[PDB]
Write a protein that holds these residues in place. Structure first.
Motif, short mmCIF file in Angstrom:
data_model
loop_
_atom_site.label_atom_id
_atom_site.label_comp_id
_atom_site.label_asym_id
_atom_site.label_seq_id
_atom_site.Cartn_x
_atom_site.Cartn_y
_atom_site.Cartn_z
N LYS A 161 0.68 -1.07 -0.01
CA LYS A 161 -0.04 0.06 0.04
C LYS A 161 0.92 1.26 -0.09
O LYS A 161 0.52 2.01 -0.76
N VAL A 162 2.02 1.27 0.77
CA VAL A 162 2.91 2.35 0.51
C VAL A 162 3.48 2.40 -0.86
O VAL A 162 3.51 3.54 -1.31
N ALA A 189 3.80 5.18 -6.19
CA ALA A 189 3.40 4.95 -7.48
C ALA A 189 2.28 5.90 -7.91
O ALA A 189 2.39 6.78 -9.14
N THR A 190 1.16 6.42 -7.18
CA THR A 190 0.23 7.37 -7.37
C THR A 190 0.91 8.87 -7.35
O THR A 190 0.46 9.68 -8.11
N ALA A 215 0.85 11.32 -10.57
CA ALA A 215 0.71 12.90 -10.39
C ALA A 215 1.83 13.57 -10.74
O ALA A 215 1.67 14.76 -11.28
N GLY A 216 2.97 13.37 -10.26
CA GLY A 216 4.32 14.16 -10.68
C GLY A 216 4.46 14.36 -12.23
O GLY A 216 5.02 15.19 -12.69
N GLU A 217 4.59 13.16 -12.87
CA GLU A 217 4.56 13.27 -14.52
C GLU A 217 3.43 14.09 -15.18
O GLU A 217 3.63 14.61 -16.03
N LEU A 218 2.18 13.84 -14.52
CA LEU A 218 0.95 14.56 -15.07
C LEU A 218 0.92 15.99 -14.79
O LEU A 218 0.32 16.83 -15.81
N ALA A 219 1.10 16.74 -13.54
CA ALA A 219 0.97 18.01 -12.90
C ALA A 219 1.81 19.05 -13.50
O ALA A 219 2.00 20.03 -12.78
#
Lengths: 48, 48, 96, 48, 48, 48
Positions: free
Chosen positions: E7-8, E13-14, E18-22
């Motif tokens: 889960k960590v 991965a989430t 977000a880092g590549e998208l934002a």
């Protein structure tokens, strides 16, 4: 490991097939993009 | 000593034949590409 | 009709240029695969040279000469694959 | 252009040249719509 | 502990996704916010 | 190895048959291509 190595060699063969095919106009478009970047640096020097 | 010599002979013979087969197949593939690049339909175009 | 014959010749030329694209793509894969082979053979030649350096550090010159014989076999095999590769490079450019 | 002036005020010439590339795209698109408009003006007068 | 660690790694991965998208305009808006903060400091210096 | 060598000798015989046949105008066309390349070098010298 030999099955994985055969899949690596398929990606190398795919990369060779792309490398011989991908001769394109886009390299001259990248030279125009670098010229446009040079215009933004000249506008930054003008602002400075 | 006979087994060590036998394994060396098998290994060398197998790998030499395998690379010779691979290079022969690549050589005839290039020769057929040059032949088909020469052998264009110029007589059919001339007939039209 | 000559217009139908020359159109059919142009259609046949679309099949031929696809066959020659396949032959180029195959030849590109063969040069890349024989590069990959000689690259890994020369990395194994470094491993066998380091195995010889360990043998010499232990004073086992017998094992050092045996390990150097593996190095010789690998570098000679890489030179054979470089010679094969030279034929692939010229054929690849000929088809291009 | 004002986003580029803010970027130059912060010293970010990279962002200033990127913002000027949006300015170039918009003014070129407005010149394309002015060219399209010239055809609409002449057609409008022809129909009138 | 391995289920919690999975889960960590899903949150990592989430965070990568977000880092590549934002990549956004908002960074230039923060430069304008800092410029507006500089105007309030200039008004505070004027009041002083 | 003798069967592979017979196929190599068939490619050599095919290359000999192509070599005696392939006397063509295209060699004079390559001299015109080199002349056209010389014109692009003269245009590059003019640009410089």
């Amino acid at each position: 490991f030999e099955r994985m190595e055969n899949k690596v060699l398929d990606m190398e063969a795919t990369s060779q097939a792309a490398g011989e095919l991908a001769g394109f106009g886009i390299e001259n478009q990248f030279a125009q993009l670098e010229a446009s970047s040079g215009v933004e640096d000249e506008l930054a020097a003008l602002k400075a | 000593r006979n087994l060590a010599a036998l394994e060396a002979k098998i290994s060398e013979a197998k790998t030499k034949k395998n690379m010779l087969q691979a290079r022969a197949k690549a050589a005839k593939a290039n020769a057929e590409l040059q032949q088909t690049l020469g052998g264009l339909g110029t007589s059919s175009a001339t007939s039209a | 009709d000559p217009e139908k014959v020359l159109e059919q010749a142009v259609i046949d030329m679309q099949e031929d240029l696809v066959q020659l694209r396949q032959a180029v793509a195959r030849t590109i894969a063969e040069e890349k695969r024989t590069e990959q082979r000689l690259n890994q053979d020369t990395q194994e030649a470094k491993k066998w040279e380091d195995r010889a350096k360990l043998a010499l550090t232990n004073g086992e010159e017998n094992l050092a000469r045996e390990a150097l014989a593996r190095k010789k076999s690998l570098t000679d095999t890489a030179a054979a694959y470089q010679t094969q590769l030279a034929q692939q490079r010229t054929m690849s450019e000929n088809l291009r």
